[PDB]
Design a protein around this ligand. Sequence first.
Ligand SMILES: Nc1ncnc2c1ncn2[C@@H]1O[C@H](COP(=O)(O)OP(=O)(O)O)[C@@H](O)[C@H]1O
Lengths: 1168, 450, 92
Amino acid sequence: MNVSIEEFTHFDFQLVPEPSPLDLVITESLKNHIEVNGVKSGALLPLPFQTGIGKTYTALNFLLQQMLEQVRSELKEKSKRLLYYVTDSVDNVVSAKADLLKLIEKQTVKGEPRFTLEQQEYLKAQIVHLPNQSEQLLQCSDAVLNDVLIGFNLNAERDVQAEWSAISGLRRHASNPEVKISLNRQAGYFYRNLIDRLQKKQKGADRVLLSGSLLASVETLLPGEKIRNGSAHVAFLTTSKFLKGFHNTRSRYSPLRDLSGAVLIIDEIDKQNQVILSELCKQQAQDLIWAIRTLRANFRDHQLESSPRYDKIEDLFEPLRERLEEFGTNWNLAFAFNTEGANLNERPVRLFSDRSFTHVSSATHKLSLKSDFLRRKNLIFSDEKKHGLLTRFVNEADVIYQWFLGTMRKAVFQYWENVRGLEIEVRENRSLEGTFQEAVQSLLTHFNLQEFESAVYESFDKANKLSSSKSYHHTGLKLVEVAHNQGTRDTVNCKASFLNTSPSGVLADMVDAGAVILGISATARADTVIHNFDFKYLNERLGNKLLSLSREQKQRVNNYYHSRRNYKDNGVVLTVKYLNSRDAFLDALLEEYKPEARSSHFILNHYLGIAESEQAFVRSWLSKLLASIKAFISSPDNRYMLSLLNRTLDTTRQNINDFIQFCCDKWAKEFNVKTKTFFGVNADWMRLVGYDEISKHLNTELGKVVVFSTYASMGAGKNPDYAVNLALEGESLISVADVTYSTQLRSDIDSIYLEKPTQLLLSDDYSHTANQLCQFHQILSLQENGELSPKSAENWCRQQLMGMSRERSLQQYHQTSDYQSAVRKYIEQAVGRAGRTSLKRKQILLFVDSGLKEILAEESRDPSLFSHEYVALVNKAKSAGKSIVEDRAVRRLFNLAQRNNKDGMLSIKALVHRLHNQPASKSDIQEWQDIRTQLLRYPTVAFQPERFNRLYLQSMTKGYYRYQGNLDGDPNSFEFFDRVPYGDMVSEEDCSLATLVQNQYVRPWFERKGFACSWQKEANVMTPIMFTNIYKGALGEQAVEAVLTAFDFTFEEVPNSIYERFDNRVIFAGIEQPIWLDSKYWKHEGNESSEGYSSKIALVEEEFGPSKFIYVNALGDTSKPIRYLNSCFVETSPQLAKVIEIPALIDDSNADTNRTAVQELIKWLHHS
Amino acid sequence: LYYVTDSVDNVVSAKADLLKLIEKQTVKGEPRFTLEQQEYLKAQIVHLPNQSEQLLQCSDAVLNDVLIGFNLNAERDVQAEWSAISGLRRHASNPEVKISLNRQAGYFYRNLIDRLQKKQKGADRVLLSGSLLASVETLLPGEKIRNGSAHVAFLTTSKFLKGFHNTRSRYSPLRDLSGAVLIIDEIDKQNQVILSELCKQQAQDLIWAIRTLRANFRDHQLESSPRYDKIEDLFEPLRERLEEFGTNWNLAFAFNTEGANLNERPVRLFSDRSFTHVSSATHKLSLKSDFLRRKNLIFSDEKIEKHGLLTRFVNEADVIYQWFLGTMRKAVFQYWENVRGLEIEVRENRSLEGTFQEAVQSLLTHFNLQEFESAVYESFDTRGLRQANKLSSSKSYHHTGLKLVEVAHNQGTRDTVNCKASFLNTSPSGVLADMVDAGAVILGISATAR
Amino acid sequence: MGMSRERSLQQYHQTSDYQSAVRKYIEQAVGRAGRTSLKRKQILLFVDSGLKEILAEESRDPSLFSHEYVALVNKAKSAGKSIVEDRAVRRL
DNA sequence: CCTTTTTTTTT
DNA sequence: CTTTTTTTTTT
Ligand SMILES: Nc1ncnc2c1ncn2[C@@H]1O[C@H](COP(=O)(O)OP(=O)(O)O)[C@@H](O)[C@H]1O
C-alpha cells in the first residue's frame, strides 16, 4: 500500500527544526554560491567536521531537509532531484540508512513530534539501499522471486529453473559459513542472468504492464527500478556501486552520466580518492595494433545512412577518416607487426608514457620501426650504433584510438540532439542515458565496428597542447606492453592500459557536470595527494565553485566543539608521553622471563621467533609498546587502553603474544590489578560478536582492559565505547558537555598508544597491471604537485617500470614532504576516533612513538578547526627540543619552475618537428601563432593563467629571475633562483626591449597589435626555454617587418611546405624571382651554418627555382657595412651573391635606424 | 580405442565389466594374466566424464598438490573459488546441495585448466612429473592419453563430440581419427545424439561476417615467410569474389527492411541449398541498393527479377561464408605441411591437431580476423573430419545440409537488420561416413543396427 | 510457418518410414526381457490391436530375429498373406 | 488430428 | 631503506 502526498498538504513547512552552529555552516556556504554562480552550476563544498560532535546527525539532517524541501515543490506543482549518499563501506551505508529511518521517527521539533506516522511511510518509501547483486538476491523471500519467474514466463527455460532450484536449495540449508560463501557467488551469477532476461523480455515488443504484486516483487528484486519508476529520492550505496551503476527494469543506469542536479553527500571524502582510483585501475587493456587496423579497414568505405536521424554525424568522423588513411600509409598498416633483432625477444617491452614530457621506456636502446616491403611485415627492431621510432608509433596510435573514442562520445551526444526533437516513440527516456544504448548501437553497426561495443560503453564515464590548460589530472599515464601474441609466434600486440583521468579529475568532472558534492570528513583538506584529492588542482580547475569557510564560520565551529568538549573548566588532564627505544628496560623483562638461556637473543629465537635480522626493529616496537603498558597499569582509575600498532598481533605471531601477555599479567600483580587483555582484534575479530564482548567486560567486571588493534583494523563505524556503571566506576568519570544531551551512560578510551603509521603508499591487488597503474599514478601525482622535482620523479618512474621492491618505493615517498602530512592525517583520525563520548575520564593519558616527535612538531595549520586531543598531542611536540621550519612553499616553487621548463622543452621540440613535415597542419600552424602571440603580448601575467599554464614560471622575484642550464640539452639539469645567483637573468633588460621600442617605427606597430612595451612587476615570468627560443626569436621577427613596412615592402604567408623555415614571403620591386626572409634578433643566436643554410635553400629552390634571401638581424650594431654572400654562403662578388646579410637595422647604443644599410639594401634589390 | 555410448551409466558399467574381465579370465582353466599384468592393463583404460564430475572425484589432497605445485595459490580468485568448493563438499548428501555443487565444480574446473594451460604452454614449463604427475593425471584423465600411458578410453558420445582436455589444450578425437577403432554400443541411438550436437551450433550474422570479410581482405596481407607458402593463393579467388560481391550488392551500406508486412513478423528463409527453398514471406522480397539514402533496402515488390532478390543475396552470402571457412580449413592443412618438417625441430606436437590452434591464430591475426576464431574452431568440430552442389559430383542432402536464416532488426537499433543464419552443414549419416573416410574402423553393436 | 506437434506426427505416419520405426521399438522392447535362461513355460505376450496390421508387414530375414519377436510376428501373419506396398516400387 | 520420457556436456 | 590490513562489485 503506497502512500500518497495528501498528508503533506497540511504540513507546516514554515516550522523548522532549530539550526545548529554545525548545521548553519552547510547552508551558509551553499546559499551564497547559488546566488553567485547560478542555480545549475554545482559545487564541491568540503566540510572539516570532527567525529563526535555531529557528522551524521548534521549530514543526515541535511539529507532529510532536502527530502522535505523537494516534496513541497512537487506538492506545489518535474523529475525529482537525486540525493545520493555515497560512502565506502556497506556497514557505514546501512548504519547511515538506519539512523536516517531512526531520525524520521524520533526527531521532535521544540519537544513535540514532527512527522505523523503516515508521513514516515512516505518518507521511508523514498529511501533506497541498493546493494551488490549477490546480497540483493539473498534478501527477497522465495515468494517474491517466484512471482517474478512465473509472471515473466522464465520458468519454461531449463537453465533458469535449474539455477533457481540450486539457489532455493542452498539458501534453505543456511547457517553454515561454508555454505554461506557459495550461496553468494551463485546468487550474483543468477541475478545477472535473471535481470538480463528480464531486460531482454521488457525492452522489446512485448511489455508487461507492471502493477500489483508483480510491481512489489520486481521492485524488491530491482530497487533501482524504484528510482526509474519515479518514486524514490535517496540512494544509499557505496562508492563502488556508484561507479558501476545499478540495474533498473530496462538497462544498467549509471549515475555518472546523470549528475546534473545530484546532491552527493559523500562521507569520509578523502578516502574515496583511493576507492575511485581502484575503479580506474580496473579497466580492460586494449590491443592498439588490432584496434587501429580494425578502425582503418572499417572506415575507408563504410558509409552511414543519410537521414535526418544522423545529420552532422558523418562530419565528426571525417578528420578521423583522413588521419586513419594517412596513419596507415605512413606505418604500412597492411602488414602485421613483429619484433626482430635478438636481445629483444627474451622479455617484453613496456613503454610508459605520461602523454607529456615524461616518456620513460623499458628498452635501454631506442627501438625503431621499419616497414619491410619484400617480406610483408612491419618490424620492430633495435639499432645500437628519427621519425620511424616505436615510441612515436605507439603515441600516435594511442592518440587516434582515443580520438575515435572521443569522437564516439560526440556522435552519441549529437545523435541525442537529432532525436530529442523527433517526437515519435522516444518515450520518457529522452536523456543521454536512454539513447546511449541505441546511439552507440546504431553507429557501431553502420560502420561495422561492433567489436568496440564494450570499449565504448565502459569508457563513457583541454587537449595535450601547449596552448591549453595542461595538467596530469585531466590526462593519464599509458602503459603499453609489446609482446608476442598467444599461440602465434610471429606477431605482437600493443596491450595498452590507460588511466585517461585521475580521481581528482573525476571529482572535478562531477562538479562540472552539475553535482553539488559535499565532503564530510575531518581530514578533508590534508596537504597530501596520495591519500586525498589534489586541492591545488581542484582549486584552479573549479575556481570559486570549490566552496570554503570564512574566518567566523571556522571560529564558530571551534566554539561549538569547545562547548561540547569542555576539557579544562570541568577538569581533565591530557598527559602526553613520548617513548624512545629503551633497550635497558626490555632487557630486564626478557631476562626475568627466561633467565636460564644464555642471553636475551636466545629468547628472541626461542620464545619469540626472531632472528638477527629484525631484532633491532622488533625490540623498538616491543620496548616502546611495553613501556606504555606499565604506565597505564600505574593508574588505577583508567581502565581502557587501545594500542594502535601497524603489525597485527594475533594468533599468527602468537609467540610474541604470550610474552606481552605475561608482562601485562606480571605488572598486574605488583600493581594490584586483575587486568585483562584482548588480543588479535582485527577486522575478522569484531565481526562475529567481537567488539561487543569488550564492552560487556567493562560493563560488569572490575579491571583494566588493554586492546591491541591496528590503524586499518579501526577504519570507521567502529564505536570504541562501553556501558558504564557507577558502582564499577566512581568519581573517575566526569561530564564535559556544558549542557546535557541524552545520557545512556557511555564512556570511551582514556589512554591510547599511537605507533608510527607505516606503509602509506597506496596499492591494488586486483591484478599486476591493476597496481601498475596505481603506482604510476602516485608518482605522477607527486610530480604534478611539486613535491618531487622532475629529476627525481622521472628517476622513480624509470625504476618503477623495470621493477622495484616495495621498500624502495616507500623510501622514495618518505623523502618527500607529502609523507609528513600523510602520517599527520592517520594520527588525526586515530585520536579523533576516541572522542565520541562526552562523558570522559579526568586522567586521559597519551603515549606515542618518538619517531613522531619531530613529525608532530612540523604541524602548522590553524588549531581553529583541530580537536582538543590532537592539539595536546602537538603542543607537547612544539614545547620540546627544537622548533624549525621546512619551507613547504618555496621548495614547491623550485620544482614547479623546473617542471614547467621541462614541459616547454619537450612540447616545443615536438611542435617544431611536427612543423618539419609537408604539409603543416592547420592546427599546428594556428597553435604556433598562439604560442608566440600570447608569449610576447603578455610577457608577465598577473594571476596564474588558466590557458597557458606551461608558458610561465612562478618566481620568488618580481618581474625576473636567474637560471642556469643547457638550454638546448637536458631539461632535468636546470637550476633556478637562489641556487644559481650568478646565472642568466630573464629580465626585460636582458632582452633590451626598451631600446627596440625607442625606435619611431617599432613603437607604433606594437600598439596596434598590443605587443608589450614594458614588463609588469608580477611574479609569473616566462619560461627560460620559451623566452630565448620563442620570444626573442619572434620579437625580432615583428621588429624587422615593422621597420621594413615604411619602405613599400610587404610580406605574405610562407607556404605550407617550408613553414618556420623562413619568416615571410617578400614581394615588391616587380622582380619575378621571389624574395624570402630570415629574421633574427642578434648575431649571437641562430648560428645557421652554411651546410644547414644550404639545406633550406634546396628545399625552396625546388619550390620556385631561383630565389633571393635576406639575413636581417634587427637590433645590433648599425656601423658595420653589409656583406654579400653566395649560395655556398662563404663569400662572393656583390652582383653574384644569392644572399645578403645586414648586421642590424636598429642601433643597440641609442636606437637609431640603419638608414644607410636599408638604402643599400633598397638599391641592392633593385639591381637584383 | 574408444568405447562410445550415449549414457553415463553404461560406460562405467562397461568399464567395470572390462576390469572384471581382466581379473576373471578362466582361459584353459587358469588365469590369463599374471598378478602384475592386470595392473598394466588397468592403467591403459581411462574413463572421461564431464568436468563437473571429474572435479568431484579427486580428493582435496590432489587439488592441493596441483594448486601449490603450479603457483596458483596467489590468484586471489582461484583460492577464493576453491574455498567454496572445498567448503561445499564437506556437507552431507543433501540433494539440494549436490545440484549446486556440480554447477560450481564444472565452472571451477574450466577456470583452473585454462590457467593450467596458459601457464604450461608458455615459457615456464612446469615439467610435470613425480607426485605432481599423479595429481594432474587424476584431475586430467585425458592426459595419460596424450602422454602414451593409455590408449583405451571410455566416454559418452557427447564427450566424443565435445573433446577432452590435456595440459596443453582441448583434444578433439574427430580430427585425429586415422587408425582409431571405435566401438559403439547401440549404434542406432547415436543418430539422435550426433544430431543433438549438430543442432547446438551458434548462429552467425551473415551481413556482419560478409562485410567484415570484405573490409579486412581488401588490403591486409600475409607475410612472405616460408611458413605461409602458397597460402595466399588459397585466398585469391575469395578476395576477387568478395570484391565482386561487395560491388554488386553495395556492401558499403547497411541493410534494412522497409515496407508493410515486414516489421510485425520477421522473415525466415529455409534452404536445402540445392532445390528446396522456402520463404516465410508470402511474396518474393527484392533487395535494392539506395545510393541516395546510402542504405540497402529489403522490400516486398507486388509485381522474375533474378538480379536483386533477397533469397539470392543470402544464398550467395552463405556460399562465400562457407567458402572462407572451407578455405580456412585448407589453409590450416597447408600451414601444417610447410611446418611439419621444414620448420625443423622448434616444436614437437607435429600433428594437424597440435598445429591447428596455432595455424588458426597466425592466419587470423595477419588478416585481422580474430573475431572469427570461435567460428573457425567450431567448424572443425563439425567438418574437421573433412580435411559439391555441382550437378557434377555426388549430390545428396547427407553432406550438403540445410540452412535456416532469420532476418530481423538488430538489438537496440531500430534501422538495421542482421541475417542470423543457423546451419546444418552435414547429417549424422554424413558425419559417420566422414568418420569412416578419415580412417576409423567403427563397430556398431545393436540388435536394430540395420 | 509453425505447425502443431500433431501435424508433424500425422505427416510422419503416412510414410512407410513410420512402420519400420515402431517395429524397431517392439524388437528392442522384447529382446531386453530375454537376458536369462531360466524361463517359465507360459511366457505370455499381449500387444495392442493397433499393431496387428503393422506387425503383419515385417518381411526381413529371420536369420537373426529373436524367438520372442518371431512368435510375435507369426500370430499377426496367421491371417493368410496380405499385399504390401512393395516399398521399392513406391520409392522409385 | 496423435496422444513424451529422456538424455550428456559445456557454459 | 625497510617495516600491512582490508575493502566493493562485477563477472
Ligand atoms: N543536537 C545534536 N547534535 C549532534 N548530534 C546529536 C544531537 N542530538 C542527537 N545527536 C546524536 O548524536 C550523534 C553524534 O554523531 P556521531 O556519529 O556520534 O558523531 P559524528 O557524526 O560527528 O561522527 C548523532 O548520531 C545523533 O543521532
